[PDB]
Amino acid sequence: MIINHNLAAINSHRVLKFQNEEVSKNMEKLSSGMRINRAGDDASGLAVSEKMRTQVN
Amino acid sequence: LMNAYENTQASESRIRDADMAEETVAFTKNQILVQSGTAMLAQANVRPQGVLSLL
């Protein structure tokens, strides 16, 4: 067994970090209550929503 | 004059007086929203607790 590096630890840390990023992404929109808050999640949806909001106002 | 007054008062009320139904609907929406937000925050503080399990 090699001891200078722990490949299983590295893989677990990577997948855990990305899972935590997904957790944060879900949590922020749970707090906000809107499907998209930052652009890029749905750019066309955001543009259409802005148009729709201008129309309702 | 006694009808010009009522017409002008109706106009002013329409301009300034609120409609209670819409305001209370918005109030209910904002209340449920703030309840959800504070619950989600409370879920957020405990989130980093899992780190120390590997300490």
Automatic annotation (TrEMBL), chain A:
Give the superkingdom in one word. Bacteria
Q: Where in the cell is it found?
A: Periplasmic flagellum; Periplasm
Q: Which residues, by range, are in coiled-coil regions? A: none
Q: What does this protein do?
A: Component of the core of the flagella.
Task: Identify its protein family.
Answer: Belongs to the bacterial flagellin family.
Return the protein name. Answer: Flagellin
Organism this protein belongs to: Leptospira biflexa serovar Patoc (strain Patoc 1 / ATCC 23582 / Paris)
